[PDB]
Design an enzyme around this catalytic site. Structure first.
Site, short mmCIF file in Angstrom:
data_model
loop_
_atom_site.label_atom_id
_atom_site.label_comp_id
_atom_site.label_asym_id
_atom_site.label_seq_id
_atom_site.Cartn_x
_atom_site.Cartn_y
_atom_site.Cartn_z
CB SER B 38 -0.99 0.07 1.17
OG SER B 38 -0.17 0.09 2.33
CB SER B 48 -0.62 0.51 5.82
OG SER B 48 -1.80 0.63 5.52
CG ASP B 49 2.73 -4.08 6.50
OD1 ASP B 49 2.37 -3.60 5.52
OD2 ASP B 49 3.18 -5.27 6.74
CD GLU B 66 7.82 -10.61 7.59
OE1 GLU B 66 6.61 -10.35 7.54
OE2 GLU B 66 8.43 -11.66 6.94
CD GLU B 75 8.00 -9.38 3.80
OE1 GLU B 75 8.15 -10.16 2.71
OE2 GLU B 75 6.79 -9.59 4.42
CD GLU B 140 -2.25 -28.20 -7.77
OE1 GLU B 140 -2.36 -27.28 -7.27
OE2 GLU B 140 -1.34 -28.91 -8.43
CD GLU B 144 -7.60 -31.78 -1.35
OE1 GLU B 144 -7.15 -32.57 -0.47
OE2 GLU B 144 -6.97 -31.66 -2.23
CE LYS B 148 -9.89 -30.92 3.92
NZ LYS B 148 -9.76 -32.46 3.58
N1 LIG Z 1 6.57 -33.93 0.10
C1 LIG Z 1 7.49 -33.58 1.04
C2 LIG Z 1 7.77 -32.06 0.77
O1 LIG Z 1 6.16 -31.54 0.66
C3 LIG Z 1 6.52 -30.00 0.39
O2 LIG Z 1 5.00 -29.36 -0.27
C4 LIG Z 1 4.28 -29.62 0.65
C5 LIG Z 1 3.02 -28.75 0.40
O3 LIG Z 1 3.50 -27.47 -0.23
C6 LIG Z 1 2.36 -29.29 -0.45
O4 LIG Z 1 1.16 -29.10 -0.68
C7 LIG Z 1 0.44 -29.22 -1.78
C8 LIG Z 1 0.37 -28.00 -2.84
O5 LIG Z 1 1.58 -27.47 -2.93
C9 LIG Z 1 -0.14 -28.32 -4.18
N2 LIG Z 1 -0.28 -27.13 -5.04
C10 LIG Z 1 -1.67 -28.86 -4.06
C11 LIG Z 1 -1.59 -30.15 -3.04
N3 LIG Z 1 -3.01 -30.69 -2.87
C12 LIG Z 1 -1.08 -29.83 -1.62
O6 LIG Z 1 -0.84 -30.89 -0.97
C13 LIG Z 1 -1.11 -30.77 0.48
O7 LIG Z 1 -2.42 -30.11 0.79
C14 LIG Z 1 -3.44 -30.61 0.51
C15 LIG Z 1 -4.60 -29.94 1.30
N4 LIG Z 1 -5.93 -30.17 0.84
C16 LIG Z 1 -3.56 -32.18 1.57
O8 LIG Z 1 -4.65 -32.99 1.35
P1 LIG Z 1 -5.52 -33.14 2.53
O9 LIG Z 1 -6.57 -32.13 2.98
O10 LIG Z 1 -6.49 -34.25 2.16
O11 LIG Z 1 -4.92 -33.59 3.81
C17 LIG Z 1 -4.35 -34.98 3.89
C18 LIG Z 1 -3.22 -34.72 5.14
O12 LIG Z 1 -2.11 -33.93 4.94
C19 LIG Z 1 -2.17 -32.81 6.06
N5 LIG Z 1 -2.48 -31.65 5.50
C20 LIG Z 1 -3.61 -31.13 5.70
N6 LIG Z 1 -3.77 -29.71 5.25
C21 LIG Z 1 -2.58 -29.64 4.58
C22 LIG Z 1 -2.08 -28.43 3.87
N7 LIG Z 1 -2.68 -27.59 3.58
N8 LIG Z 1 -0.68 -28.51 3.43
C23 LIG Z 1 0.08 -29.68 3.78
N9 LIG Z 1 -0.51 -30.75 4.19
C24 LIG Z 1 -1.69 -30.83 4.77
C25 LIG Z 1 -2.83 -33.54 7.13
O13 LIG Z 1 -2.17 -34.13 8.04
C26 LIG Z 1 -3.95 -34.12 6.49
O14 LIG Z 1 -4.53 -35.46 7.20
C27 LIG Z 1 -2.30 -32.97 0.79
O15 LIG Z 1 -2.28 -34.18 1.50
C28 LIG Z 1 -1.04 -32.28 1.17
N10 LIG Z 1 -0.01 -33.01 0.42
O16 LIG Z 1 2.12 -30.85 0.32
C29 LIG Z 1 3.31 -31.02 0.61
C30 LIG Z 1 3.21 -31.64 2.20
O17 LIG Z 1 2.56 -32.73 2.22
C31 LIG Z 1 7.48 -29.71 -0.76
N11 LIG Z 1 6.83 -30.12 -2.06
C32 LIG Z 1 8.79 -30.41 -0.58
O18 LIG Z 1 9.47 -29.72 0.74
C33 LIG Z 1 8.61 -31.90 -0.19
O19 LIG Z 1 8.19 -32.47 -1.63
N1 LIG Z 2 10.49 -12.18 -3.35
C1 LIG Z 2 10.46 -13.05 -4.44
C2 LIG Z 2 10.13 -14.43 -4.40
O1 LIG Z 2 9.27 -14.16 -3.36
C3 LIG Z 2 9.04 -15.77 -2.83
O2 LIG Z 2 8.17 -15.76 -1.25
C4 LIG Z 2 6.92 -15.21 -1.51
C5 LIG Z 2 6.09 -15.84 -0.26
O3 LIG Z 2 6.76 -17.06 0.02
C6 LIG Z 2 6.50 -14.95 0.69
O4 LIG Z 2 5.57 -14.88 1.52
C7 LIG Z 2 6.02 -14.55 2.78
C8 LIG Z 2 6.12 -15.57 3.67
O5 LIG Z 2 6.72 -16.66 3.16
C9 LIG Z 2 6.61 -15.40 5.20
N2 LIG Z 2 6.66 -16.43 6.13
C10 LIG Z 2 5.92 -14.00 5.77
C11 LIG Z 2 5.85 -12.85 4.82
N3 LIG Z 2 4.99 -11.69 5.29
C12 LIG Z 2 5.35 -13.33 3.52
O6 LIG Z 2 5.34 -12.06 2.73
C13 LIG Z 2 4.39 -12.02 1.87
O7 LIG Z 2 2.92 -12.21 2.46
C14 LIG Z 2 2.36 -10.99 3.12
C15 LIG Z 2 1.18 -11.08 3.34
N4 LIG Z 2 0.83 -10.46 4.66
C16 LIG Z 2 2.81 -9.63 2.13
O8 LIG Z 2 2.34 -8.58 2.82
P1 LIG Z 2 0.91 -7.51 2.90
O9 LIG Z 2 -0.45 -7.92 3.13
O10 LIG Z 2 1.67 -6.17 3.51
O11 LIG Z 2 1.02 -7.28 1.38
C17 LIG Z 2 1.86 -6.49 0.62
C18 LIG Z 2 1.80 -6.51 -0.92
O12 LIG Z 2 2.00 -8.23 -1.23
C19 LIG Z 2 1.00 -8.50 -2.18
N5 LIG Z 2 0.74 -9.90 -1.24
C20 LIG Z 2 -0.60 -9.66 -0.44
N6 LIG Z 2 -0.88 -10.87 0.01
C21 LIG Z 2 0.22 -11.73 -0.15
C22 LIG Z 2 0.68 -13.10 0.22
N7 LIG Z 2 -0.27 -13.72 0.82
N8 LIG Z 2 1.62 -13.49 -0.48
C23 LIG Z 2 2.74 -12.55 -0.97
N9 LIG Z 2 2.31 -11.57 -1.50
C24 LIG Z 2 1.35 -11.14 -1.00
C25 LIG Z 2 0.06 -7.69 -2.36
O13 LIG Z 2 0.32 -7.08 -3.73
C26 LIG Z 2 0.22 -6.70 -1.46
O14 LIG Z 2 -0.28 -5.24 -2.02
C27 LIG Z 2 4.02 -9.56 1.81
O15 LIG Z 2 4.46 -8.26 1.08
C28 LIG Z 2 4.47 -10.69 1.00
N10 LIG Z 2 5.95 -10.53 0.52
O16 LIG Z 2 6.64 -13.29 -0.29
C29 LIG Z 2 7.04 -13.82 -1.03
C30 LIG Z 2 6.11 -12.92 -2.31
O17 LIG Z 2 6.10 -11.43 -2.11
C31 LIG Z 2 10.22 -16.74 -2.75
N11 LIG Z 2 10.71 -16.30 -1.36
C32 LIG Z 2 11.28 -16.68 -3.62
O18 LIG Z 2 10.53 -17.31 -4.74
C33 LIG Z 2 11.38 -14.99 -4.10
O19 LIG Z 2 11.99 -14.73 -2.75
MG LIG Z 3 -7.58 -36.26 2.26
MG LIG Z 4 -5.87 -34.88 -0.40
#
Ligand SMILES: NC[C@@H]1O[C@H](O[C@H]2[C@@H](O)[C@H](O[C@@H]3[C@@H](O)[C@H](N)C[C@H](N)[C@H]3O[C@H]3O[C@H](CN)[C@@H](OP(=O)(O)OC[C@H]4O[C@@H](n5cnc6c(N)ncnc65)[C@H](O)[C@@H]4O)[C@H](O)[C@H]3N)O[C@@H]2CO)[C@H](N)[C@@H](O)[C@@H]1O
Ligand SMILES: NC[C@@H]1O[C@H](O[C@H]2[C@@H](O)[C@H](O[C@@H]3[C@@H](O)[C@H](N)C[C@H](N)[C@H]3O[C@H]3O[C@H](CN)[C@@H](OP(=O)(O)OC[C@H]4O[C@@H](n5cnc6c(N)ncnc65)[C@H](O)[C@@H]4O)[C@H](O)[C@H]3N)O[C@@H]2CO)[C@H](N)[C@@H](O)[C@@H]1O
Ligand SMILES: [Mg+2]
Ligand SMILES: [Mg+2]
Ligand SMILES: [Mg+2]
Ligand SMILES: [Mg+2]
EC number: 2.7.7.-
Lengths: 252, 252
Positions: B38, B48-49, B66, B75, B140, B144, B148
């Site tokens: 912003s 705002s931050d 950060e 940040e 994805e 899903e 749910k």
């Molecule tokens: N594999 C080792 C490790 O994994 C890392 O990646 C993470 C994470 O980035 C990734 O999320 C997936 C997304 O990147 C992708 N775009 C879509 C996939 N569907 C994501 O998979 C994960 O998220 C869904 C959430 N719906 C999980 O399905 P589900 O709700 O059925 O839950 C099954 C069990 O999994 C655990 N769980 C629950 N919610 C989450 C979320 N939000 N993220 C991760 N795990 C979750 C919970 O215990 C539940 O019982 C789906 O199973 C899940 N895989 O997923 C992996 C970690 O699993 C990197 N790729 C890398 O570091 C390395 O490969």
């Molecule tokens: N930098 C290049 C690129 O970035 C990649 O990483 C991503 C993403 O992983 C990362 O998210 C950060 C988290 O990983 C970390 N744990 C905490 C940080 N606060 C995260 O930063 C990002 O998320 C916050 C959300 N509050 C953003 O702040 P804010 O509400 O003030 O929004 C400011 C502007 O940024 C855009 N925006 C809005 N929401 C998001 C979210 N959820 N993610 C990313 N951008 C967002 C929007 O336009 C708004 O006006 C914060 O600014 C944001 N940095 O952040 C970066 C993406 O920016 C990888 N690390 C790598 O590929 C490489 O470094």
């Molecule tokens: Mg499941």
């Molecule tokens: Mg699943």
């Protein structure tokens, strides 16, 4: 049309079909195959999906296959042992949501106790990592959320307040799970299990009852419950020693 | 504690103090410094931050600072040109939420037009990446989510339905933003800008006003609105050609 109803035995039949395809395609590069999620916990519902993990011997392997048949959905993750163990010992802010997958793996194929190794690694994460993740969560997420709802109070928009309140309650749930170093069973039970834990920050339970009941239309009560929860946080952190450094103006 | 009220002029003083430290520490390794969020749009509110980006010449540089002073939060992201440009041209499911940061950068330092290079890269992504991201999003996330909430209808828990409904509305907003290849201004305005776009999937508008108004307590009204949006998805994807082949049981 959408996910159809399936029983546990039909889902397990699909699992073994995939396991045979995995072994036929990759052969001796497969170290282990396991089922996680609700199917691995044997609590899958009629509309639950299938989540499988594969340990590869393959050097720097990291890929995934995620598809639908129109009737059901499957996700299979493929990782080397080094990549998987590294991920299982890394504590991010959403660790209580994600890393429960390593605590109830249903073994399907295992040439050398690899699935037991992943379980031991996930449950033996050093205490300091949870401490660092809690302090990072407060700065990166909770402090930022506080700025967003305080902006809403003075300038709007109130239409974002219900969604923001849901995010705050979830972040608080992660905070509690990191403190107790306990993963939640599933995404649907995160808030239900969070409010039943001990050592809750003051005001968190009250905030959760808006989100769990869906009564998110009273903007002025939501802003007050959020403010009470935020004040409870810094109480809460000084009691448990999760102290944040606020001393440097530019910390690099 | 929390974030205190700050004016734009106080924020810009902090920005130039930080830029001034950055150049002293890294010198000729700094290619560019910009402000996003912003403050970069010059629409920052009282609470705002501060969000800054820095392009480094040092290959494979990727780190971030950060922190909070207890009163305000900053940040600063540090990336090499190649890592930043690669990220700016990658279209994930939350692209409409994240990549607006590359479209309104406030320049502070630029030794070679790098900030303009990042902007041109972000807006010049071929359409195919958005087509693939839309198809991935449906498989994805949306498919899903449908499994749910259908589980919630038959076995609970109903206390998860408000949170799940918020997630579905956000995923639908990403779907619309990907279709139109437009990023939302900020997180608070995602739903407001999503429902104002054209060619919406049927039933999405009705679902969003539950979330935007905070009326998430009528569980059966929510479940029917979700099913209507899901039906709208199928006709919408059919009509625009975001179709994946779902005929094989194991597509690898
Ligand atoms: N594999 C080792 C490790 O994994 C890392 O990646 C993470 C994470 O980035 C990734 O999320 C997936 C997304 O990147 C992708 N775009 C879509 C996939 N569907 C994501 O998979 C994960 O998220 C869904 C959430 N719906 C999980 O399905 P589900 O709700 O059925 O839950 C099954 C069990 O999994 C655990 N769980 C629950 N919610 C989450 C979320 N939000 N993220 C991760 N795990 C979750 C919970 O215990 C539940 O019982 C789906 O199973 C899940 N895989 O997923 C992996 C970690 O699993 C990197 N790729 C890398 O570091 C390395 O490969
Ligand atoms: N930098 C290049 C690129 O970035 C990649 O990483 C991503 C993403 O992983 C990362 O998210 C950060 C988290 O990983 C970390 N744990 C905490 C940080 N606060 C995260 O930063 C990002 O998320 C916050 C959300 N509050 C953003 O702040 P804010 O509400 O003030 O929004 C400011 C502007 O940024 C855009 N925006 C809005 N929401 C998001 C979210 N959820 N993610 C990313 N951008 C967002 C929007 O336009 C708004 O006006 C914060 O600014 C944001 N940095 O952040 C970066 C993406 O920016 C990888 N690390 C790598 O590929 C490489 O470094
Ligand atoms: Mg499941
Ligand atoms: Mg699943
Ligand atoms: Mg900001
Ligand atoms: Mg910020």
């Amino acid at each position: 049309n959408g996910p159809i109803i399936m029983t546990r035995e039909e889902r397990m039949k699909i699992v073994h079909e995939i396991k045979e395809r995995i072994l036929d395609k990759y052969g001796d590069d497969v170290k282990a195959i396991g089922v996680y999620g609700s199917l691995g916990r044997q609590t899958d519902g009629p509309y639950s999906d299938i989540d499988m993990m594969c340990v590869m011997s393959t050097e720097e392997a990291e890929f995934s296959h995620e598809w639908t048949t129109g009737e059901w959905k499957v996700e299979v993750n493929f990782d080397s042992e080094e990549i998987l163990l590294d991920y299982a010992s890394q504590v991010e802010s959403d660790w209580p949501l994600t890393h429960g997958q390593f605590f109830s793996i249903l073994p399907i194929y295992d040439s050398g106790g690899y699935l037991e190794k992943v379980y031991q690694t996930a449950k033996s994460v050093e205490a300091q990592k949870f401490h660092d993740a809690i302090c990072a969560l407060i700065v990166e997420e909770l402090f930022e959320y506080a700025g967003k709802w305080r902006n809403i109070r003075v300038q709007g928009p109130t239409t974002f307040l219900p969604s923001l309140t849901v995010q705050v309650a979830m972040a608080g749930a992660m905070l509690i799970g990191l403190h107790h170093r306990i993963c939640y069973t599933t995404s649907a039970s995160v808030l239900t299990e969070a409010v039943k834990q001990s050592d809750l920050p003051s005001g968190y339970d009250h905030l959760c009852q808006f989100v769990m009941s869906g009564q998110l239309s009273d903007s002025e009560k939501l802003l007050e419950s959020l403010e009470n929860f935020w004040n409870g946080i810094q109480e809460w952190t000084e009691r448990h020693g999760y102290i944040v450094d606020v001393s440097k103006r530019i910390p690099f």
